[PDB]
Amino acid sequence: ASIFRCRQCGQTISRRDWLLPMGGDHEHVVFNPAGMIFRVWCFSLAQGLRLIGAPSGEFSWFKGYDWTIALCGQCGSHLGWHYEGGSQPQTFFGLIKDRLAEGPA
Ligand SMILES: O=C1CC[C@H](N2C(=O)c3ccccc3C2=O)C(=O)N1
Ligand SMILES: [Zn+2]
């Protein structure tokens, strides 16, 4: 089965069935302009989230997709981002592995 929760509150965010092989792997190692290296896991579906701010294509790690920040809908923890703007798929979620916790139903 297997699902992914907000590590700060237990909120259910997504699950393994929903991983999306972007580029060929669901996991991307990236860094940002702050010099922080995350591991980002890509889902085609997520629930339990609140999106914040405007879509933005600056700094995007993924070609043709703008991002908006995704917060845990329950606790406000920054779980990662929602991506929109592209084709096959149009939108998807890029979530910071470290901020989730993977366990069972
Ligand atoms: O696709 C993305 C999501 C946004 C993400 N991001 C951050 O992790 C960051 C940290 C500090 C300043 C600016 C940003 C930025 O745009 C980033 O670098 N790429
Ligand atoms: Zn939470």
Author numbering: 19 to 123
Tell me what the authors wrote about this structure, in their words:
Ito et al. showed that cereblon associates with damaged DNA binding protein 1 (DDB1) to act as a substrate receptor for the DDB1/cullin4 E3 ubiquitin ligase complex. In mammals, cereblon has a LON domain and a C-terminal thalidomide binding domain. However, homologs of the latter, also termed the CULT domain, are further found in animals and bacteria as single-domain proteins, that have all essential residues of the thalidomide binding site conserved. Architecturally, the thalidomide binding domain is a member of the β-tent fold, which consists of two antiparallel beta sheets that are oriented at an approximately right angle and pinned together at the top via a structural zinc ion.
In addition to the orthorhombic and the high-resolution trigonal crystal form, we obtained a hexagonal crystal form in a co-crystallization screen with thalidomide; we solved the structure of this third crystal form by molecular replacement, locating four monomers in the ASU. Surprisingly, only two of them are in the known thalidomide-bound conformation—the other two form an intertwined dimer and have no thalidomide bound. The two monomers of this dimer, depicted blue and pink in Fig 3, are in grossly different conformations: The blue monomer adopts an overall conformation comparable to the thalidomide-bound state but has the β3-β4 hairpin shifted in position. Therefore, the stabilizing hydrogen bond between the hairpin and the first tryptophan (W79) of the cage is broken, and the latter is found flipped out of the aromatic cage. In contrast, the conformation of the pink monomer is very different. The binding pocket is not formed and essentially all regions previously identified to be flexible are dramatically different from the thalidomide-bound conformation: In the first flexible region, the loop connecting β2 and β3 is disordered to a similar extent as in the “Wash I” structure, while the β3-β4 hairpin is shifted in position and even has another strand register. The whole second flexible region is found in an entirely different conformation—the amplitude of its largest displacement, at W79, is 30Å. Consequently, as also Y83 is not in place to anchor the second to the third region, the third flexible region is actually found in two alternative conformations, both different from the thalidomide-bound state. Intriguingly, the W79 side chain of the pink monomer reaches over to the binding site of the blue monomer to complete the aromatic cage. At the later stages of refinement, electron density of unknown origin became apparent within this cage, which was convincingly modeled as a DMSO molecule from the thalidomide stock solution.
